[PDB]
mmCIF file of C-alpha atoms in Angstrom:
data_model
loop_
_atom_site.group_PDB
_atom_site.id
_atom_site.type_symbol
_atom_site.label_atom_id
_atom_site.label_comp_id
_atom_site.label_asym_id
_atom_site.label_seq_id
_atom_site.Cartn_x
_atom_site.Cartn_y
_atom_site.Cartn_z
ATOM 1 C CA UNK A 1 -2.909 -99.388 5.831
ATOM 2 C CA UNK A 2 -1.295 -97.502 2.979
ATOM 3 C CA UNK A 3 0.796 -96.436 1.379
ATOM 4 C CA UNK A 4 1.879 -93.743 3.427
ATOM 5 C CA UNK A 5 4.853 -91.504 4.287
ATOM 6 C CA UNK A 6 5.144 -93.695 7.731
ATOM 7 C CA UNK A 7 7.376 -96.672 7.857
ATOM 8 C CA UNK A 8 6.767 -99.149 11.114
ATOM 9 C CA UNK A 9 10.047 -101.463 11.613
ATOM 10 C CA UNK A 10 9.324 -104.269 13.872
ATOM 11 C CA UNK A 11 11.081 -107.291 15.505
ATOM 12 C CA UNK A 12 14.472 -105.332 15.343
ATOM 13 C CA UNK A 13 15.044 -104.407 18.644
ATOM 14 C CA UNK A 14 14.799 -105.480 22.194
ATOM 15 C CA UNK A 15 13.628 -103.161 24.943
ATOM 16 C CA UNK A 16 17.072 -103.728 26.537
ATOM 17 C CA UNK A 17 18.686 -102.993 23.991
ATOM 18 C CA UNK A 18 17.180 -99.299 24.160
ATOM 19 C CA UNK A 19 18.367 -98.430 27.663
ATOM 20 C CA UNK A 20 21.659 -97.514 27.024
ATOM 21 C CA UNK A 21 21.800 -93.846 25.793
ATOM 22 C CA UNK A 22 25.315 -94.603 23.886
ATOM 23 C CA UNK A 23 23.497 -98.094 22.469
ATOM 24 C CA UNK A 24 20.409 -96.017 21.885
ATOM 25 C CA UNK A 25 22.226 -93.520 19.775
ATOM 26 C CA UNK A 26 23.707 -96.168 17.763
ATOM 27 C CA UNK A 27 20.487 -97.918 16.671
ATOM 28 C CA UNK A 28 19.107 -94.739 15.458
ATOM 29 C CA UNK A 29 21.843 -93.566 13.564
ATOM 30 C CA UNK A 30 21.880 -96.956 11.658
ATOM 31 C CA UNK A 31 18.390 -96.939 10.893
ATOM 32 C CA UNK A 32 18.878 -93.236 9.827
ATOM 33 C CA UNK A 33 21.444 -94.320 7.455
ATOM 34 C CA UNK A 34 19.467 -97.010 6.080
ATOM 35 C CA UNK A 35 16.658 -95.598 5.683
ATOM 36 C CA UNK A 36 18.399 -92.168 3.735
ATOM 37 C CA UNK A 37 19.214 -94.748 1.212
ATOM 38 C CA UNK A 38 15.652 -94.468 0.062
ATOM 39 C CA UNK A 39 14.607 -90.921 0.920
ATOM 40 C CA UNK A 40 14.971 -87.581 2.970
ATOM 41 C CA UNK A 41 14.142 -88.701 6.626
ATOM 42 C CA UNK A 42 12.367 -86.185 8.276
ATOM 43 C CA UNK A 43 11.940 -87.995 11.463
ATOM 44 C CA UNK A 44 12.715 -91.055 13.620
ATOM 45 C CA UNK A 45 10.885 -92.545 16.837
ATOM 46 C CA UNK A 46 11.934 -94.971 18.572
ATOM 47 C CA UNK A 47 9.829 -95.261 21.962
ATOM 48 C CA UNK A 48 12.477 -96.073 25.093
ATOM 49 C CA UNK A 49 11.213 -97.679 28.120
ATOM 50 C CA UNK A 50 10.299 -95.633 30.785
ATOM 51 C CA UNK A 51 10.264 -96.293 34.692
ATOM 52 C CA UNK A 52 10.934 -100.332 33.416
ATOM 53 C CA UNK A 53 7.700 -100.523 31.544
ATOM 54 C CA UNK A 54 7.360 -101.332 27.646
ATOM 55 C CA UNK A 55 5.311 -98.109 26.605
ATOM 56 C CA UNK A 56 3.158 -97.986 23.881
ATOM 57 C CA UNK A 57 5.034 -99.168 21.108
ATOM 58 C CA UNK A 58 8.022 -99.974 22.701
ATOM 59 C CA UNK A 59 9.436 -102.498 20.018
ATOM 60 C CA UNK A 60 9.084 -100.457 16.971
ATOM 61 C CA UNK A 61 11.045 -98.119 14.689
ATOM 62 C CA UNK A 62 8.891 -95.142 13.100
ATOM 63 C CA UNK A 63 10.388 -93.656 10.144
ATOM 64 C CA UNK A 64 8.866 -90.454 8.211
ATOM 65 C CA UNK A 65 9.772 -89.980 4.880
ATOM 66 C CA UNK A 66 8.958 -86.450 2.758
ATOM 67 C CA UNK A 67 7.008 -88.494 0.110
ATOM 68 C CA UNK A 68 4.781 -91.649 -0.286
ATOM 69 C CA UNK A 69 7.309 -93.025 -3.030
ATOM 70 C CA UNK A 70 10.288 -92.458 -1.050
ATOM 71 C CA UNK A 71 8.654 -94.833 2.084
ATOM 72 C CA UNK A 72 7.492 -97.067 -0.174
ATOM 73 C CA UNK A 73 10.699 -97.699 -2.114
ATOM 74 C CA UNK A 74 12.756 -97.596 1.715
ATOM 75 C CA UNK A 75 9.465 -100.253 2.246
ATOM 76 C CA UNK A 76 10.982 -102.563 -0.245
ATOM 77 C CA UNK A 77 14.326 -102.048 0.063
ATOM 78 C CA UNK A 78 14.116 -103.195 4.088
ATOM 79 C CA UNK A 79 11.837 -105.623 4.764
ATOM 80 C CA UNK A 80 12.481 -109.508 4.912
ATOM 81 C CA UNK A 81 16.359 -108.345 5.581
ATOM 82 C CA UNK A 82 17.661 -108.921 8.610
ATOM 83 C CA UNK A 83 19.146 -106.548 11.270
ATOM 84 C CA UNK A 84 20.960 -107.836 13.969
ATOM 85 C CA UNK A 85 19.885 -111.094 12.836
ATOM 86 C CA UNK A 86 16.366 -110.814 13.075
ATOM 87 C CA UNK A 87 14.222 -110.716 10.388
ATOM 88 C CA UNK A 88 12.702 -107.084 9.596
ATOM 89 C CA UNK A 89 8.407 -106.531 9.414
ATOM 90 C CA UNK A 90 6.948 -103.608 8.193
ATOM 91 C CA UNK A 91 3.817 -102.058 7.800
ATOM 92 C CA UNK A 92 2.573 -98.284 6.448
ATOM 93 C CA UNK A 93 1.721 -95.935 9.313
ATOM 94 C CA UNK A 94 -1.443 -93.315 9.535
ATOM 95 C CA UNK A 95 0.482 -90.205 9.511
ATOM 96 C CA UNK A 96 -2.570 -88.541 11.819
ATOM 97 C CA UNK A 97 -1.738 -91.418 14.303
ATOM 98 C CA UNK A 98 1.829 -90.536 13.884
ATOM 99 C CA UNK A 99 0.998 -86.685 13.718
ATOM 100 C CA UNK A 100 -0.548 -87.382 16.807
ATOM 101 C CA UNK A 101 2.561 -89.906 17.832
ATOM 102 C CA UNK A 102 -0.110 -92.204 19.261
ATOM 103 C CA UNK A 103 1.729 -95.484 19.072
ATOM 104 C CA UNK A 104 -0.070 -99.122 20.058
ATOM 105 C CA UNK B 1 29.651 -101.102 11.853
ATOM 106 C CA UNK B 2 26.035 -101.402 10.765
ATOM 107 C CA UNK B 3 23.801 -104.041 12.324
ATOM 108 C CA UNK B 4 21.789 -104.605 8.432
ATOM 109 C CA UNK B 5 22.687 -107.534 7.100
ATOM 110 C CA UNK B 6 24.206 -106.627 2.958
ATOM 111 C CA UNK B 7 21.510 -108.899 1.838
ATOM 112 C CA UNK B 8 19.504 -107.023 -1.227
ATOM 113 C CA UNK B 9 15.624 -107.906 0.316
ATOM 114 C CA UNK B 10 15.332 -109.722 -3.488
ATOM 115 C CA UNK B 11 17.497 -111.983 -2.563
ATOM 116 C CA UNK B 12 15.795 -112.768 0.744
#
């Protein structure tokens, strides 16, 4: 898919790792400030596990960015770096899937 | 305190 204004971030964070509202909290506001590096963010999801259950895309990061260029360039600036020492893989998300924040 | 690595992805 793509390009879009939808970044997907995957293999950066464990479900544990998301449980924590203080460690929650932090992971967002780093991938915030990452990802402002590249554009205006107009929104982040990260989906949280719920009654101990990995939800529908539990394990990602969504970013939105207010252009196509602006995701793209935050696109190459992030991906094959690592965060917390895992190595970061993106793809372009629908932004109807995302309008409709179906997540798989 | 970030948890990115300062790694430009070019240099990956």
């Amino acid at each position: 898919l793509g390009s879009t204004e939808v970044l997907c971030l995957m293999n950066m964070v464990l479900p544990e790792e998301l449980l924590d509202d203080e460690e929650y909290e932090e992971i967002v506001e780093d991938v915030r400030d990452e990802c402002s590096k590249y554009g205006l963010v107009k929104s982040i999801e990260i989906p949280r596990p719920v009654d101990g259950v990995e939800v529908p895309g539990c394990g990602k990061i969504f970013v939105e960015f207010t252009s196509v260029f602006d995701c793209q360039k935050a696109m190459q600036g992030l991906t094959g770096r690592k965060f917390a020492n895992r190595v970061v893989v993106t793809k372009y998300c629908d932004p109807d899937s995302y309008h409709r924040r179906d997540f798989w | 305190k970030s948890r990115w690595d300062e790694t430009p992805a070019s240099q990956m």
